[PDB]
Amino acid sequence: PERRAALVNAAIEVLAREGARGLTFRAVDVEANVPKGTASNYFPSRDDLFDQVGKRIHERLNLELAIEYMQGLFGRITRDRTGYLALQELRLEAVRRPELRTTLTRTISENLKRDIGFHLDSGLPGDRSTVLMLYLAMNALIVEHLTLPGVLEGVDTERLVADLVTRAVATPDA
Amino acid sequence: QNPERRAALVNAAIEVLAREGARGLTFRAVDVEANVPKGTASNYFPSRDDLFDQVGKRIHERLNLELAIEYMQGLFGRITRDRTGYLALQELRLEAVRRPELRTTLTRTISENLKRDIGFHLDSGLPGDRSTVLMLYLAMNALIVEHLTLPGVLEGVDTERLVADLVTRAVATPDA
Fold this sequence. Notes:
Strand content of chain A: under 5%
Chains A, B: Possible transcriptional regulator, TetR family protein
Keywords: Rhodococcus sp., tetR family protein, Structural Genomics, PSI-2, Protein Structure Initiative, Midwest Center for Structural Genomics, mcsg, transcription
Radius of gyration of chain A: 18 Å
CATH superfamily of chain A: Tetracycline Repressor, domain 2
Entry title: Crystal structure of transcriptional regulator RHA06399 from Rhodococcus sp. RHA1
CATH topology of chain A: Tetracycline Repressor, domain 2
Structural class of chain A: mainly alpha
PDB class: transcription
Number of strands of chain A: 0
Oligomer: homodimer
Distance between the termini of chain A: 50 Å
Number of domains of chain A: 1
Assembly: dimeric
């Protein structure tokens, strides 16, 4: 129950450090808080291991307030480095493993549906494109920083995030 | 026979990366995939470190408002054809965390290409600032990745309208 969650974390650490191919029951145990030979007893298959994290991953990851929030969320990035990176590894593996693709699709879809619903209900200006656009730009911003920080080195990321939110909430006719 | 056959090998590696991953990329796996499957890769690349770098420097070669919009939508169609280039790129990004030499090389390539697009936009007479191009760059990158990896996420999304909405909002320049 909780021992499983401890193992799911150990898997998330292994994905972020080593990769999808690196993720194995041997490596999960070594990384795990019970390194005896536990993993194979908690997960029927390596295929089901990826699935568990696939279902679990998002637990580890007035216009002024929306802005401040997004900027602060991009700040918490360096700590949650590991969660966003394992997520990236899961995305790539999802192309190769259909069961993971199904599971990761639902999780991300439902989470995105909730953010759209939250925003529409919040009274903030903006439509569905607002949330999709913010969802997409923020995702890529986080990935760029984590993988190639040098790319955004000359970038004022605080102003960028302010500009992005401020433009996204606008609803012109396209 | 030297620079050209090397380009074939880089392609073989871009295919291997997209299909298998960064750990899956080895000289052995390249030859098997290569246009010359004998045992050519090791003689063209001093190290596995140096192979990643070659693709790292090469990768982007494989990957009026009405027009800008139209182009973006079209470019998001050319996505499925060059599925393999964008996926190898993703594999390169993640590998870049683990290999600083690749990180330096991929950083330069992406930075310079991004600098050119900012320069092009500013020169083009399109409305918009640096944020315009940065936010289009970012939204477009993530849109492409989502489609290639979890197509089901965007299934109920009108991606043509979304791209039109993205370009139209991005070019606006309000005070934030």
